[PDB]
Design a protein around this nucleic acid. Structure first.
Lengths: 117, 196, 67, 228
RNA sequence: UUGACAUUGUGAAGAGACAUAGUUUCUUUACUUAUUCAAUGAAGCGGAGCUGGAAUUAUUUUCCACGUUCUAGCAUUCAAGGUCCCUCGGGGCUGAUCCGGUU
RNA sequence: GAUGGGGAAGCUCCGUUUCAAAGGCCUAGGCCACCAUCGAAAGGGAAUCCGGUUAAGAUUCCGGAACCUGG
């Protein structure tokens, strides 16, 4: 018995995939790990001035990385707490990230610790 | 040439954006085929490119709890808030759509169907109407006089709305200039000016 | 066996039985898609004489082309 | 109860919405369903040459059931029984004596279309069953005429699937018997006589009378009204 | 544009010929399944009685089925009721006549 | 502008709901409706303003004060 004139395809059971062999036999490692997220610090005069007068670090970041990954890499590599992250693409084809540290951390101290000033 | 190029329909397509919508009678269904249904003409609105105003008539869905909107061609004399009856048993009143068999010979109707189920094919221009000149119960067919004056016979099951299409006398005013003609053709199609 | 009976029957295309079966089959095929698979050959003798074998890997397809 | 009051509904034709109803007669069936139904209708609306409609006259349920009951006693050796007999042969023929004679004479039904036809015209077949639902009808059209010419009893039984299941197969176009046990001789003779009287003795005048001249329900009603 | 060939099938009746057995060839008129057109989220298609009535012949002729016309709102929850079973409530009939290729 | 289909020897053409078995919600059981997608930095839109700051950036950066969305 049916009360509608529109016949529809029955919702048959669909079997879940169960391949007999591994798709690639090896899972790929982290393509954008913390070390890969950050490439090199920027030591431009304006960047150095921002370090002391703004408590903001300037780093070179891979194009694939985003704000979340940049923040995670900064926190993990240096144990620093990041207030905010700003990023831009330089005219030379590289990404520049402006990372602001919280009041509990000093940009100059971390800059000295890493080994640049 | 221009007439041959018209077949391609590249720049001669109708400007259909501002048109309100296709004007058609109610779908011939069980309710209309056997009985009749009552609708309310909520409003009448002008249709771009058409001289005959359209009337918005809403009918409740017999098989579902919802309101179905229909766009009928407004007949002269109808007014907003009037009740429109569609079906075999509908009375002979202006604005009602009745089968040609039900209406007596001599009745004046417009938007009359050529065949049952076409939703209105004949007498659609402003001020136009057909006249039922004779009934033929044997193999029921209705003889009508079309606006052009030609006499035609069609199935009595064909429906039509009593009265005449509104907007009569439109072509009785000289246009007086190319501007009004250009404005009129702006929404009809790319067929003006007509080069000799 | 049935080889020659079917082989000769298919030749009498103008017979009433064949002229009716052909009409039924052409009506049936016209409703289906232009190209569609056939579950089994409609002429087992012809398929067999054309190298067909009744085992997995052999497929029969039905297609019509405009005249 | 005073708190409960009746609320009759007046669905009518121009008032409150109709209730749910069965629309099986109006549903839009899948294209293949409509195609097969129209094919079935066409197969009955067109005049069928006499060789067609020679089927669709099937053995009655009583005699068909009796024939199937008799045939069930001679189902061919199945896979398990075949393996058991192979083990018996491998353990007696070489380790014993009587090369290939360790097992008795087997009795089983014959169902291969080519094999069944090959048995006929020789002729050794005693009873033949022909399926009435073979899609390539040409495969079985000659079987009734061939049996009539050879004087071999034949029956058009309903369902190739039933014949196939009777012989451990999905489907079987034909089934026949060549050798039967003496105890079942009377039953075989009775079944042969009944099948002959039903089909063989009748398929000489039935070769005429083209069938398929049945109109539809609406057409039948219209013609009856016109005649009345 | 036009004549022919295949899609072109199936009934009834009228006329020339087979052989005073009975089969064919033409003509006239009919049916659809071939085929074509149009519509529908394929919903009321055909038939029959109708619990009906209006309406008269001799036996049941004919109409519809018999839930809507002073008004710019409302009509939706397996529909309420009755009925029989298993109670907070769940299930069959009816409400909504039966049978049979969406129109 | 694909998909379902219909043409074309063929590169490919027609067509966007059309003659498709076209999918999406409640707790194993019920219920609900016809279509992909692209297409505007001048169309519609969910939200920020003030002071200062560079050799070159801000309604984006800083000091201050609010708003919109999801949980």
């Amino acid at each position: 018995v049916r009360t509608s004139a529109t016949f529809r395809l029955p919702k048959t059971l669909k079997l879940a995939r169960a391949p007999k062999y591994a798709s690639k036999a090896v899972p790929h490692y982290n393509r954008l790990d913390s070390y890969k997220v950050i490439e090199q610090p920027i030591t431009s005069e304006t960047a150095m001035k921002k370090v002391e007068d703004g408590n903001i670090l300037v780093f070179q970041v891979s194009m694939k990385a985003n704000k979340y990954q940049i923040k995670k890499a900064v926190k993990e590599l240096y144990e620093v707490d990041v207030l905010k992250v700003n990023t831009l693409v330089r005219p030379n084809g590289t990404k520049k990230a402006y990372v602001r540290l919280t009041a509990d951390y000093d940009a100059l101290d971390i800059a000295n610790r890493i080994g640049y000033i | 040439i221009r007439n041959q190029r018209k077949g391609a329909g590249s720049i001669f397509t109708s400007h259909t954006r501002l048109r309100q919508g296709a004007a058609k009678l109610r779908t011939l269904d069980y309710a209309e085929r056997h009985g009749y249904i009552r609708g309310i003409v909520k409003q009448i609105v002008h249709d771009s490119g058409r001289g005959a105003p359209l009337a918005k008539v809403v009918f409740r869905d017999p098989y579902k709890y919802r309101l179905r909107e229909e766009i009928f061609i407004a007949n002269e004399g109808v007014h907003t808030g009037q009740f429109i009856y569609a079906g075999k048993k509908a009375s002979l009143n202006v604005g009602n759509v009745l089968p040609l068999g039900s209406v007596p010979e001599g009745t004046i109707v417009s938007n009359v169907e050529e065949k049952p189920g076409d939703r209105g094919a004949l007498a659609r221009a402003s001020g136009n109407y057909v006249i039922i000149i004779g009934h033929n119960p044997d193999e029921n067919k209705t003889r009508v006089r079309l606006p052009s004056g030609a006499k035609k016979v069609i199935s009595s099951d064909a429906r039509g709305v009593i009265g005449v299409i509104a907007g009569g006398g439109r072509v009785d005013k000289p246009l007086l200039k190319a501007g009004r003609a250009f404005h009129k053709y702006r929404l009809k199609r790319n067929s003006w000016p007509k080069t000799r | 066996g049935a080889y020659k009976y079917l082989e000769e029957l298919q030749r009498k295309k103008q017979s009433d039985v064949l002229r009716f079966l052909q009409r039924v089959r052409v009506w049936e095929y016209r409703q289906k898609n232009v190209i569609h698979r056939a579950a089994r050959p409609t002429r087992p003798d012809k398929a067999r004489r054309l190298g067909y074998k009744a085992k997995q890997g052999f497929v029969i397809y039905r297609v019509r082309v405009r005249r | 109860n005073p708190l409960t009051h009746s609320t009759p509904k007046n669905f009518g034709i121009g008032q409150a919405v109709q209730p749910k109803r069965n629309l099986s007669r109006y549903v839009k069936w899948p294209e293949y369903v409509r195609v097969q139904r129209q094919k079935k209708i066409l197969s009955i609306r067109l005049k069928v040459p006499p060789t067609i409609a020679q089927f669709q006259y099937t053995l009655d349920r009583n005699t068909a059931a009796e024939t199937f009951k008799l045939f069930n006693k001679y189902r061919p050796e199945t896979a398990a029984e075949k393996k058991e007999r192979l083990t018996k042969e491998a353990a007696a023929v070489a380790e014993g004596k009587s090369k290939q004679d360790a097992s008795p004479k087997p009795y089983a039904v014959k169902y291969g279309l080519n094999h069944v036809v090959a048995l006929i015209e020789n002729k050794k077949a005693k009873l033949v069953l022909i399926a009435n639902d073979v899609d390539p009808i040409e495969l079985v059209v000659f079987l009734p005429a061939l049996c009539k010419k050879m004087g071999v009893p034949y029956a058009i039984v309903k369902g190739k699937a039933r014949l196939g299941t009777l012989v451990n197969q999905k489907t079987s176009a034909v089934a026949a018997l060549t050798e039967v046990r003496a105890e079942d001789e009377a039953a075989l003779a009775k079944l042969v006589s009944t099948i002959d009287a039903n089909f063989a003795d009748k398929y000489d005048e039935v070769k005429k009378h083209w069938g398929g001249g049945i109109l539809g329900n609406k057409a039948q009603a219209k013609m009856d009204k016109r005649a009345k």
